[PDB]
């Protein structure tokens, strides 16, 4: 579940992120790969070095998926249907890894939104990312 | 746990900038708000009805100090975390009965608090080094289950 | 998600369990309390000894909730609404614990259904119990 | 890990009844079927399209033997699981990069296989003792992350 409060908190947070969405996505990816090196095995063909155009490009895609989820918060399974299929079936992502990327996305937001990242907003974002992760892991 | 010198530097340099009277209660507070089942082990502390209640609560701020005290300790003893936390494990395991996933969560919340406070300073390599630390602390705290 | 195959597997399994539902529930509880002693703290006022009328009684309630979920597999959040509220809000059950009880429920079924507990049926039951657990943890 | 004598007895007595040519491939097989992302580390083994494919697959049955071989080993060395699994940890951690939650899962699947095969014999105390074992093995295998 996501309360109306959680939804306004999440919308608010994404509002302030603004056009930095893609860049924060790339940063969250880098945080994940450095902090949790096991996640690197899903991207053997990427250059994962700092400044990698491939991480940057992929960060924008991750952020765009998250924004699409925010924009359709009440029907995420439908919105995220192809992505769920991709990650469970083709990519076979270990469900544990969604928790790790979600934490790095939270770290990234915290690192950039000193005002917005209140305890309440932290809580709402955590639930939002857990709901996305639930969707993305629904199709094994 | 094995931190490289650059990892040790990244951790130590930031850790000296930490307000040890505050970060502890901020991390603990957020844990109780974000993961509300953790409030099961703290009914005594009083008004935990709201985030403002939990955050602006004395017993939380009081207790997070010690909690933060623990992490500082192990930051001096990455060689002997098991030896460092020996006592406190029987406390949370044999006496309190707490799942070790919850220690990982507190560690992650502390990392979010560090990012919030240090912003740009909390770079991805600095985070990576802090993750090794909280991972090693969480594991050592859970040795009385292992 | 639960495929039509998963649903027929789960229905089949519950069919063979039959009137032993409550007894298996009590057994699963005992397996959990012995294997995962941390779970015992949620029942301070229970006698948890073997043969405990309180474990037996509670086992029947657990099984009846599971059967109600099976019987309304397509609308579990509605069916399990009060139970989700109870466990998240009043009881504050650590979400980790649902995984542990689910494993003991699987062990119990395996211990009693040598014929039914095929690899495919194992898989379907795992997903069924993960869906119930998702519901019961949706309301923090 | 500390098993009491009654715990050691419960484990050893059942373990001597185990078909070491079969249980291993049954546990591994079920793991690949129940937790399909684990099939990421086994594309080589061939037809894993179906449960029958996975279960009736040579490389699975072949490999589960060793896997089962590992658990038997540590059953003799609850005192020194870290020493026992030292090598194999760098294999799954440094070389394969596998999350330690997955070792817990294999352990739990092995427990389900033991219950399936022994039925009534696999009582709740016998399960409890086997849980300590697979917990200790999973942890020792993950020491190269810790
Ligand atoms: C909030 C969680 C996640 C979101 C929103 C997300 C989003 C996306 C999106 C939008 C793509 C687009 C691919 C494309 O269309 O070009 C993608 C691909 C991919 N994702 Fe994720 N993802 C998440 C979690 C994960 C995790 C945890 C992993 C593994 C650690 C992962 C691994 C991959 C891989 C390997 C690809 C394909 C990479 C390639 O070869 O191009 N994802 N993801
Ligand atoms: C993460 C979930 C945790 C929970 C739910 C938990 C729970 C508790 C509880 C109930 C107490 C007793 C407080 C009281 O009611 O009087 C306590 C004490 C304490 N905890 Fe935690 N704990 C957790 C993790 C940790 C961690 C990771 C650390 C440090 C690394 C820590 C450090 C301490 C200390 C230093 C004390 C008390 C010291 C003393 O009283 O002498 N706790 N904990
Ligand atoms: C498949 C998962 C679960 C199901 C289907 C389930 C079902 C139920 C049901 C039907 C009740 C009925 C209470 C009543 O109406 O009298 C109940 C109560 C309760 N459950 Fe669960 N439950 C599950 C998981 C858990 C877990 C993991 C825990 C903690 C380890 C837990 C702890 C409790 C407690 C403490 C009560 C109240 C006990 C009392 O004081 O009477 N439950 N549950
Ligand atoms: C649970 C998730 C696990 C995964 C995903 C995994 C994955 C793998 C992979 C990919 C290999 C190499 C096989 C190949 O492709 O040639 C391997 C080897 C092996 N694994 Fe696992 N592993 C897991 C857990 C375990 C555990 C818990 C044990 C024993 C306690 C174990 C015992 C072994 C052994 C004995 C070998 C090979 C020995 C040799 O070749 O000399 N594995 N594993």
XYZ file of C-alpha atoms and ligand atoms in Angstrom:
744
model
C 0.000 0.000 0.000
C 0.897 3.657 -0.511
C -1.085 6.263 1.399
C -2.010 9.646 -0.082
C 0.710 11.099 2.154
C 3.353 8.708 0.743
C 2.231 9.631 -2.785
C 2.494 13.367 -2.185
C 5.887 12.847 -0.467
C 7.195 10.865 -3.441
C 5.807 13.345 -5.976
C 7.352 16.182 -3.976
C 10.756 14.454 -3.897
C 10.718 13.786 -7.666
C 9.636 17.387 -8.224
C 12.779 18.738 -6.569
C 15.055 16.170 -8.258
C 13.805 17.753 -11.490
C 15.980 17.429 -14.594
C 18.722 15.815 -12.521
C 16.700 12.543 -12.632
C 18.959 10.803 -15.173
C 22.180 11.957 -13.513
C 21.032 10.717 -10.113
C 20.117 7.385 -11.723
C 23.648 7.024 -13.093
C 25.040 7.938 -9.664
C 22.842 5.369 -7.914
C 24.069 2.747 -10.339
C 27.697 3.659 -9.570
C 27.038 3.566 -5.841
C 25.536 0.086 -6.216
C 28.401 -1.307 -8.316
C 31.046 0.006 -5.908
C 29.219 -0.915 -2.683
C 27.853 -4.256 -3.847
C 30.319 -5.665 -6.386
C 28.247 -8.824 -6.917
C 25.768 -6.670 -8.811
C 28.464 -6.035 -11.409
C 28.026 -9.484 -12.952
C 24.760 -8.449 -14.580
C 26.694 -5.908 -16.666
C 29.791 -7.774 -18.012
C 29.646 -5.878 -21.306
C 29.404 -2.441 -19.700
C 32.335 -0.267 -18.951
C 31.502 0.542 -15.327
C 34.293 3.078 -14.795
C 33.488 6.533 -13.513
C 32.166 8.763 -16.296
C 31.151 5.798 -18.388
C 28.744 6.958 -21.087
C 27.110 3.541 -20.743
C 26.380 3.955 -17.032
C 25.159 7.497 -17.690
C 22.891 6.324 -20.497
C 21.563 3.457 -18.419
C 21.027 5.721 -15.407
C 18.601 7.797 -17.482
C 16.661 4.684 -18.401
C 16.421 3.617 -14.744
C 15.262 7.118 -13.725
C 12.756 7.233 -16.603
C 11.263 3.914 -15.427
C 10.974 5.234 -11.872
C 9.345 8.458 -13.106
C 6.901 6.408 -15.177
C 6.077 4.483 -11.979
C 5.553 7.705 -10.006
C 3.414 9.039 -12.869
C 1.238 5.924 -12.750
C 1.583 5.105 -9.076
C -1.911 3.556 -8.865
C -1.282 1.064 -11.689
C 2.406 0.163 -11.393
C 2.077 -3.539 -12.347
C 0.582 -2.486 -15.694
C 3.071 0.363 -16.156
C 6.037 -1.844 -15.177
C 4.862 -5.028 -16.987
C 7.554 -5.301 -19.686
C 10.283 -4.366 -17.180
C 9.157 -7.098 -14.744
C 9.293 -9.618 -17.605
C 12.727 -8.451 -18.651
C 14.334 -8.646 -15.183
C 12.809 -11.939 -14.003
C 12.823 -13.930 -17.256
C 15.610 -12.695 -19.507
C 17.962 -11.218 -16.954
C 17.128 -13.492 -14.003
C 17.990 -10.804 -11.482
C 18.356 -12.105 -7.961
C 15.510 -10.407 -5.960
C 18.022 -9.430 -3.267
C 19.569 -7.015 -5.727
C 16.479 -4.794 -5.865
C 16.952 -4.024 -2.178
C 20.537 -2.987 -2.831
C 19.695 -0.676 -5.740
C 16.793 0.759 -3.753
C 19.156 1.609 -0.891
C 21.586 3.311 -3.293
C 18.701 5.287 -4.854
C 17.777 6.422 -1.319
C 21.405 7.304 -0.580
C 21.601 9.302 -3.817
C 18.429 11.278 -3.018
C 19.655 11.898 0.543
C 22.972 13.132 -0.876
C 21.190 15.670 -3.076
C 18.045 16.699 -1.134
C 19.032 17.936 2.323
C 15.671 19.681 2.745
C 13.327 17.065 1.255
C 14.832 13.938 2.790
C 13.004 14.182 6.114
C 12.301 11.041 8.182
C 8.751 11.010 6.780
C 9.871 11.492 3.178
C 12.573 8.792 3.689
C 9.825 6.416 4.815
C 7.574 7.163 1.836
C 10.390 6.774 -0.675
C 11.379 3.468 0.914
C 7.832 2.163 0.475
C 7.647 3.493 -3.075
C 10.875 1.718 -4.047
C 9.769 -1.467 -2.283
C 6.535 -1.399 -4.284
C 8.450 -0.957 -7.568
C 10.764 -3.805 -6.518
C 7.786 -6.001 -5.673
C 6.420 -5.395 -9.165
C 9.774 -6.004 -10.845
C 10.097 -9.346 -8.977
C 6.524 -10.591 -9.483
C 7.176 -12.650 -12.613
C 9.597 -15.494 -11.776
C 36.969 -7.006 7.974
C 39.628 -6.000 5.426
C 39.573 -2.293 4.592
C 42.284 -1.063 2.191
C 44.175 2.086 3.301
C 42.119 4.256 0.893
C 38.977 2.663 2.395
C 40.229 3.324 5.947
C 41.057 6.923 4.961
C 37.634 7.505 3.387
C 35.906 6.300 6.569
C 38.130 7.940 9.185
C 38.257 11.334 7.464
C 34.471 11.629 7.351
C 33.942 10.083 10.759
C 35.845 12.870 12.520
C 33.337 15.375 11.126
C 30.381 13.516 12.671
C 28.319 15.096 15.465
C 28.382 12.129 17.855
C 25.594 13.652 19.966
C 23.129 13.709 17.061
C 23.820 11.293 14.191
C 23.207 8.316 16.498
C 19.688 9.388 17.432
C 18.973 10.393 13.863
C 19.891 6.892 12.591
C 17.963 5.092 15.350
C 14.996 7.432 15.008
C 14.780 6.910 11.243
C 14.996 3.145 11.729
C 11.887 3.212 13.985
C 10.029 5.402 11.547
C 11.043 3.638 8.294
C 10.845 0.078 9.656
C 7.992 0.333 12.217
C 8.283 -3.274 13.445
C 11.542 -2.234 15.068
C 9.338 -0.228 17.493
C 8.337 -3.564 18.994
C 11.580 -3.556 20.943
C 10.976 -0.013 22.252
C 7.420 0.349 23.642
C 8.938 1.762 26.845
C 10.362 4.877 25.136
C 6.927 6.527 24.995
C 5.316 8.518 22.186
C 6.328 6.788 18.944
C 2.994 7.622 17.312
C 4.599 9.951 14.765
C 7.957 10.701 13.096
C 8.147 14.020 15.004
C 7.297 12.019 18.140
C 10.086 9.477 17.533
C 12.675 11.997 16.325
C 11.923 14.567 19.033
C 12.067 11.823 21.681
C 14.666 11.842 24.509
C 15.084 8.098 24.981
C 15.744 7.692 21.233
C 18.345 10.473 21.142
C 19.749 9.138 24.416
C 20.011 5.570 23.136
C 21.348 6.397 19.653
C 24.411 7.866 21.333
C 25.450 4.426 22.617
C 24.443 2.856 19.321
C 26.695 5.377 17.563
C 29.253 4.702 20.296
C 29.300 1.060 19.203
C 30.043 1.799 15.540
C 32.921 4.149 16.438
C 34.445 1.366 18.541
C 34.394 -1.202 15.720
C 35.837 1.432 13.383
C 38.994 1.103 15.491
C 38.814 -2.696 15.431
C 38.022 -3.993 11.922
C 40.575 -6.680 12.773
C 38.562 -7.935 15.752
C 34.892 -7.063 15.383
C 33.831 -10.384 16.900
C 36.059 -9.682 19.898
C 34.783 -6.102 20.087
C 31.051 -6.891 20.036
C 31.167 -10.227 21.925
C 29.100 -9.066 24.912
C 26.510 -7.070 22.921
C 25.717 -10.064 20.709
C 24.404 -12.200 23.588
C 22.383 -9.094 24.459
C 20.575 -8.759 21.096
C 20.563 -12.463 20.289
C 20.202 -14.469 23.544
C 18.446 -11.707 25.522
C 16.542 -9.562 22.989
C 16.063 -12.139 20.159
C 16.512 -9.833 17.125
C 16.848 -10.895 13.495
C 20.282 -10.063 11.968
C 18.580 -8.560 8.910
C 17.642 -5.723 11.266
C 21.287 -4.922 11.994
C 21.860 -4.633 8.251
C 18.906 -2.230 8.125
C 20.245 0.030 10.905
C 23.591 0.051 9.090
C 21.898 1.100 5.868
C 19.888 3.777 7.694
C 23.122 5.112 9.232
C 24.557 5.282 5.706
C 21.494 7.296 4.551
C 22.015 9.645 7.506
C 25.687 10.095 6.595
C 24.713 10.908 2.990
C 22.066 13.389 4.149
C 24.554 15.219 6.381
C 27.604 15.146 4.118
C 25.899 15.485 0.752
C 28.467 15.646 -2.062
C 31.215 14.583 0.379
C 29.617 11.159 0.703
C 30.895 9.997 -2.664
C 30.267 6.526 -4.088
C 33.723 5.255 -2.947
C 33.183 6.657 0.533
C 29.810 4.925 0.658
C 31.398 1.657 -0.555
C 33.887 1.773 2.293
C 31.160 2.537 4.861
C 29.127 -0.424 3.496
C 32.019 -2.806 4.311
C 32.076 -1.398 7.825
C 28.365 -1.704 8.611
C 28.338 -5.145 6.991
C 31.154 -6.277 9.294
C 29.475 -4.735 12.336
C 26.100 -6.305 11.537
C 27.717 -9.718 11.122
C 29.711 -9.467 14.343
C 26.568 -8.456 16.265
C 24.818 -11.556 14.952
C 27.556 -14.030 15.892
C 25.346 -15.314 18.747
C 23.019 -16.767 16.075
C 25.688 -17.974 13.655
C 1.558 -13.500 -10.050
C 0.118 -17.009 -9.823
C -0.423 -18.928 -13.047
C -3.389 -21.250 -13.592
C -0.923 -24.117 -13.127
C 0.238 -22.762 -9.735
C -3.414 -22.384 -8.693
C -4.334 -25.941 -9.635
C -1.142 -27.215 -7.923
C -2.006 -25.354 -4.718
C -5.649 -26.464 -4.804
C -4.498 -30.035 -5.399
C -2.081 -29.893 -2.445
C -4.748 -28.488 -0.086
C -7.164 -31.136 -1.350
C -4.901 -33.959 -0.189
C -4.062 -32.241 3.123
C -7.813 -32.461 3.750
C -9.028 -32.399 7.354
C -5.436 -32.510 8.580
C -5.181 -28.757 7.772
C -5.345 -27.587 11.403
C -2.959 -30.269 12.664
C -0.384 -29.418 10.008
C -0.726 -25.743 10.963
C 0.077 -26.562 14.590
C 3.039 -28.663 13.429
C 4.365 -25.856 11.225
C 4.146 -23.509 14.175
C 6.137 -25.951 16.333
C 8.740 -26.389 13.618
C 9.129 -22.605 13.413
C 9.461 -22.083 17.178
C 12.079 -24.830 17.512
C 14.061 -23.952 14.368
C 13.848 -20.180 14.709
C 13.652 -19.389 18.431
C 13.512 -15.628 17.809
C 9.968 -16.141 16.565
C 9.010 -17.250 20.069
C 8.999 -13.679 21.378
C 5.731 -12.933 19.603
C 4.028 -15.537 21.809
C 5.247 -14.847 25.403
C 1.858 -15.780 26.856
C 1.593 -19.079 24.986
C 2.718 -22.358 26.350
C 4.791 -23.505 23.372
C 5.533 -27.003 24.680
C 4.736 -30.022 22.563
C 1.035 -30.884 22.730
C 0.122 -27.394 23.818
C -3.608 -26.881 23.320
C -2.753 -23.252 22.570
C -0.402 -24.108 19.703
C -2.940 -26.625 18.403
C -5.740 -24.071 18.569
C -3.617 -21.421 16.906
C -2.462 -23.854 14.216
C -6.090 -24.281 13.138
C -6.484 -20.532 12.841
C -3.336 -20.258 10.698
C -4.529 -23.117 8.454
C -8.023 -21.598 8.207
C -6.495 -18.288 7.049
C -4.417 -20.096 4.426
C -7.470 -22.045 3.221
C -9.432 -18.794 2.996
C -6.577 -17.422 0.856
C -6.609 -20.493 -1.406
C -10.406 -20.210 -1.636
C -10.111 -16.582 -2.735
C -6.767 -16.769 -4.487
C -7.676 -14.020 -6.991
C -8.547 -11.462 -4.293
C -6.160 -12.216 -1.424
C -5.559 -8.588 -0.329
C -9.304 -8.213 0.288
C -9.605 -11.659 1.890
C -6.511 -11.103 4.068
C -7.195 -7.413 4.910
C -7.865 -7.690 8.662
C -4.976 -10.155 9.083
C -2.530 -7.783 7.334
C -3.660 -4.992 9.678
C -3.272 -7.200 12.715
C 0.274 -8.410 11.931
C 1.779 -5.110 10.741
C 0.074 -2.659 13.113
C -0.815 -4.412 16.353
C 1.708 -7.216 16.339
C 4.509 -5.477 14.412
C 5.791 -8.750 13.009
C 9.222 -8.484 11.466
C 8.700 -9.264 7.710
C 11.611 -11.719 7.842
C 9.481 -13.975 9.999
C 6.972 -14.670 7.220
C 9.745 -16.325 5.224
C 10.562 -18.561 8.170
C 6.965 -19.662 8.766
C 6.512 -20.184 5.032
C 9.532 -22.500 4.975
C 8.166 -24.492 7.930
C 4.754 -24.752 6.211
C 6.582 -26.134 3.146
C 8.561 -28.543 5.328
C 5.341 -29.718 6.990
C 3.617 -30.360 3.640
C 6.720 -32.158 2.335
C 6.734 -34.300 5.490
C 3.136 -35.373 4.887
C 2.694 -35.424 1.076
C 5.350 -37.654 -0.483
C 3.335 -37.934 -3.705
C 2.101 -34.343 -4.080
C 5.288 -32.495 -3.171
C 6.873 -32.673 -6.621
C 9.405 -30.030 -7.737
C 6.606 -28.269 -9.643
C 4.165 -28.392 -6.727
C 6.968 -27.192 -4.370
C 7.467 -24.202 -6.669
C 3.763 -23.327 -6.792
C 3.346 -23.592 -3.032
C 6.396 -21.386 -2.516
C 4.858 -18.696 -4.726
C 1.481 -19.055 -3.031
C 3.018 -18.579 0.422
C 5.135 -15.668 -0.814
C 1.985 -13.998 -2.139
C 0.195 -14.473 1.209
C 3.287 -13.099 2.975
C 3.382 -10.117 0.629
C -0.232 -9.366 1.527
C 0.345 -9.828 5.254
C 3.302 -7.380 5.094
C 1.677 -4.719 2.893
C 0.404 -2.490 5.700
C 3.381 -1.117 7.675
C 28.548 -23.918 15.295
C 27.461 -25.352 18.662
C 25.287 -28.452 18.334
C 24.248 -30.138 21.607
C 24.753 -33.939 21.744
C 21.009 -34.529 21.132
C 21.290 -32.157 18.139
C 24.381 -34.001 16.849
C 22.563 -37.330 17.320
C 19.444 -36.130 15.486
C 21.555 -35.030 12.503
C 23.998 -37.941 12.318
C 21.354 -40.649 12.728
C 19.305 -39.354 9.801
C 22.313 -38.484 7.685
C 23.474 -42.105 7.519
C 20.160 -43.025 5.881
C 20.672 -40.500 3.063
C 21.193 -41.660 -0.534
C 24.275 -39.549 -1.286
C 23.936 -40.221 -5.025
C 20.465 -38.661 -5.212
C 19.558 -36.186 -2.456
C 22.251 -33.776 -3.679
C 20.829 -33.502 -7.186
C 17.311 -33.353 -5.822
C 18.190 -30.342 -3.615
C 20.117 -28.541 -6.374
C 17.462 -29.350 -8.961
C 14.653 -28.004 -6.772
C 16.659 -24.844 -6.100
C 16.867 -24.121 -9.867
C 13.189 -24.802 -10.313
C 11.877 -22.957 -7.216
C 14.277 -19.997 -7.430
C 14.770 -19.609 -11.221
C 17.322 -16.777 -10.967
C 19.743 -19.364 -9.632
C 19.737 -20.768 -13.209
C 21.763 -17.711 -14.176
C 24.845 -19.443 -12.829
C 24.131 -22.627 -14.826
C 23.331 -21.802 -18.485
C 25.977 -24.349 -19.518
C 24.085 -27.337 -18.053
C 21.638 -27.384 -20.977
C 17.872 -27.911 -20.968
C 16.555 -26.097 -17.885
C 13.332 -25.145 -19.669
C 11.197 -27.330 -17.398
C 11.235 -29.005 -13.960
C 11.460 -32.438 -15.651
C 14.286 -30.974 -17.758
C 16.201 -29.714 -14.701
C 15.504 -32.750 -12.507
C 16.195 -35.302 -15.247
C 19.426 -33.478 -16.137
C 22.873 -35.144 -15.815
C 24.957 -32.082 -14.984
C 22.541 -31.197 -12.151
C 22.609 -34.705 -10.670
C 26.368 -34.776 -11.253
C 26.949 -31.439 -9.534
C 24.567 -31.981 -6.596
C 26.763 -34.883 -5.537
C 29.655 -32.514 -4.772
C 27.249 -30.014 -3.254
C 25.962 -32.798 -0.993
C 29.596 -33.810 -0.502
C 30.247 -30.358 0.955
C 27.473 -30.544 3.561
C 28.616 -33.989 4.757
C 32.113 -32.574 5.270
C 30.943 -29.673 7.455
C 28.769 -32.108 9.412
C 32.070 -33.538 10.668
C 33.474 -30.073 11.365
C 30.897 -27.858 13.119
C 33.886 -26.680 15.155
C 35.722 -25.377 12.084
C 33.298 -24.589 9.278
C 35.301 -21.524 8.252
C 38.422 -23.684 8.041
C 36.498 -26.392 6.185
C 34.963 -24.169 3.492
C 37.832 -21.645 3.158
C 38.670 -22.472 -0.469
C 35.061 -22.779 -1.708
C 34.175 -19.327 -0.371
C 36.630 -17.503 -2.654
C 35.064 -19.632 -5.394
C 31.445 -18.488 -4.858
C 32.315 -15.018 -3.605
C 35.472 -13.773 -5.403
C 35.030 -15.937 -8.525
C 31.275 -16.540 -8.941
C 29.895 -13.456 -7.080
C 26.830 -15.050 -5.408
C 24.612 -13.475 -2.758
C 24.762 -15.284 0.636
C 20.958 -15.287 0.825
C 21.178 -17.929 -1.905
C 23.190 -20.271 0.314
C 20.453 -19.970 2.930
C 17.946 -20.885 0.211
C 19.835 -24.024 -0.887
C 20.048 -25.015 2.782
C 16.306 -24.583 3.173
C 15.658 -26.537 -0.038
C 17.881 -29.358 1.266
C 15.780 -29.347 4.446
C 12.580 -29.655 2.338
C 14.171 -32.578 0.483
C 15.069 -34.274 3.775
C 11.475 -33.842 5.000
C 10.080 -35.222 1.736
C 12.278 -38.328 1.944
C 12.038 -39.021 5.672
C 8.465 -37.922 6.288
C 7.471 -38.512 9.922
C 11.127 -39.194 10.817
C 11.988 -35.569 10.108
C 10.472 -34.342 13.352
C 10.470 -30.699 14.447
C 13.549 -31.208 16.711
C 15.413 -32.972 13.921
C 14.570 -30.091 11.600
C 15.727 -27.571 14.243
C 19.096 -29.283 14.447
C 19.449 -29.400 10.641
C 18.602 -25.655 10.506
C 21.603 -24.878 12.761
C 23.783 -26.894 10.412
C 22.710 -25.286 7.134
C 22.836 -21.871 8.806
C 26.447 -22.491 9.851
C 27.361 -23.825 6.411
C 25.737 -20.892 4.605
C 27.584 -18.423 6.824
C 30.946 -20.133 6.394
C 30.497 -20.165 2.601
C 29.884 -16.422 2.683
C 32.945 -15.528 4.764
C 34.601 -14.093 1.620
C 31.989 -11.294 1.720
C 31.901 -10.791 5.484
C 14.144 0.021 -9.042
C 14.735 -1.034 -9.641
C 15.067 -1.140 -11.159
C 14.622 -0.379 -12.184
C 13.607 0.786 -12.138
C 15.227 -0.858 -13.413
C 15.034 -0.327 -14.681
C 15.613 -0.797 -15.843
C 15.342 -0.315 -17.182
C 14.380 0.841 -17.533
C 16.066 -1.024 -18.062
C 15.982 -0.722 -19.583
C 16.701 -1.607 -20.579
C 16.441 -0.930 -21.902
O 15.235 -0.771 -22.229
O 17.416 -0.543 -22.608
C 16.838 -2.008 -17.317
C 17.722 -2.951 -17.812
C 18.573 -3.773 -17.092
N 18.623 -3.932 -15.711
Fe 17.385 -2.914 -14.458
N 16.072 -1.916 -13.091
C 16.015 -2.119 -11.716
C 16.712 -3.096 -11.013
C 17.761 -3.871 -11.492
C 18.698 -4.664 -10.705
C 18.659 -4.821 -9.170
C 19.560 -5.252 -11.550
C 20.761 -6.176 -11.246
C 21.623 -5.928 -10.245
C 19.229 -4.830 -12.892
C 19.894 -5.219 -14.027
C 19.600 -4.844 -15.313
C 20.272 -5.340 -16.491
C 21.420 -6.366 -16.559
C 19.588 -4.640 -17.664
C 19.953 -4.818 -19.147
C 21.321 -4.169 -19.314
C 21.738 -4.253 -20.755
O 22.374 -5.269 -21.136
O 21.434 -3.296 -21.509
N 18.133 -3.996 -12.825
N 16.529 -1.834 -15.966
C 18.683 -3.189 14.297
C 17.774 -3.667 15.143
C 18.000 -3.556 16.658
C 17.026 -3.676 17.556
C 15.538 -3.926 17.211
C 17.616 -3.516 18.870
C 16.954 -3.560 20.079
C 17.480 -3.186 21.298
C 16.785 -3.149 22.571
C 15.311 -3.525 22.824
C 17.644 -2.741 23.506
C 17.297 -2.555 25.003
C 16.845 -1.109 25.199
C 15.791 -1.005 26.272
O 14.589 -1.265 25.969
O 16.157 -0.650 27.426
C 18.923 -2.489 22.865
C 20.085 -2.056 23.478
C 21.270 -1.658 22.879
N 21.575 -1.726 21.523
Fe 20.193 -2.340 20.041
N 18.973 -3.311 18.698
C 19.258 -3.329 17.347
C 20.508 -3.162 16.774
C 21.629 -2.606 17.346
C 22.912 -2.364 16.703
C 23.226 -2.702 15.223
C 23.723 -1.795 17.618
C 25.204 -1.339 17.509
C 26.042 -1.716 16.537
C 22.980 -1.682 18.854
C 23.464 -1.161 20.032
C 22.851 -1.237 21.262
C 23.463 -0.806 22.496
C 24.886 -0.199 22.592
C 22.403 -1.086 23.587
C 22.415 -0.851 25.117
C 23.784 -0.743 25.779
C 23.554 -0.789 27.265
O 22.383 -0.596 27.682
O 24.530 -1.018 28.023
N 21.712 -2.180 18.652
N 18.779 -2.774 21.521
C 1.427 -17.338 6.292
C 1.677 -16.513 7.329
C 0.707 -16.233 8.514
C -0.611 -16.513 8.620
C -1.541 -17.149 7.562
C -1.075 -16.073 9.924
C -2.365 -16.200 10.419
C -2.794 -15.771 11.660
C -4.157 -15.807 12.146
C -5.365 -16.373 11.367
C -4.199 -15.284 13.382
C -5.541 -15.199 14.161
C -5.604 -14.492 15.499
C -7.028 -14.710 15.943
O -7.932 -14.294 15.171
O -7.257 -15.300 17.038
C -2.848 -14.879 13.743
C -2.420 -14.293 14.921
C -1.116 -14.059 15.324
N 0.042 -14.228 14.572
Fe -0.002 -14.897 12.652
N 0.014 -15.542 10.608
C 1.133 -15.628 9.787
C 2.412 -15.189 10.113
C 2.864 -14.824 11.375
C 4.251 -14.663 11.798
C 5.484 -14.831 10.886
C 4.254 -14.311 13.094
C 5.447 -14.039 14.037
C 6.541 -14.821 14.056
C 2.883 -14.270 13.549
C 2.485 -13.954 14.824
C 1.195 -13.896 15.284
C 0.810 -13.479 16.612
C 1.731 -13.017 17.758
C -0.714 -13.577 16.634
C -1.613 -13.254 17.839
C -1.339 -14.350 18.861
C -2.219 -14.141 20.062
O -1.793 -13.414 20.996
O -3.338 -14.709 20.074
N 2.064 -14.581 12.485
N -2.024 -15.194 12.661
C 23.005 -21.244 -3.442
C 23.411 -20.629 -4.549
C 24.649 -21.138 -5.302
C 24.920 -20.827 -6.566
C 24.030 -19.929 -7.460
C 26.160 -21.486 -6.927
C 26.792 -21.433 -8.152
C 27.840 -22.236 -8.551
C 28.472 -22.255 -9.856
C 28.104 -21.378 -11.069
C 29.449 -23.164 -9.835
C 30.364 -23.505 -11.036
C 29.711 -24.649 -11.808
C 29.987 -24.542 -13.286
O 29.273 -23.760 -13.982
O 30.914 -25.249 -13.766
C 29.473 -23.771 -8.515
C 30.337 -24.756 -8.073
C 30.288 -25.463 -6.882
N 29.414 -25.241 -5.822
Fe 27.844 -23.822 -5.878
N 26.603 -22.181 -5.817
C 25.703 -21.995 -4.787
C 25.800 -22.529 -3.512
C 26.563 -23.598 -3.102
C 26.591 -24.197 -1.776
C 25.734 -23.712 -0.579
C 27.464 -25.225 -1.814
C 27.915 -26.207 -0.699
C 27.722 -26.007 0.609
C 28.013 -25.285 -3.151
C 28.950 -26.193 -3.590
C 29.634 -26.137 -4.782
C 30.713 -27.029 -5.135
C 31.234 -28.165 -4.219
C 31.156 -26.580 -6.548
C 32.251 -27.117 -7.500
C 33.386 -27.907 -6.859
C 34.443 -28.086 -7.913
O 34.119 -27.872 -9.110
O 35.598 -28.438 -7.562
N 27.442 -24.287 -3.907
N 28.478 -23.175 -7.765
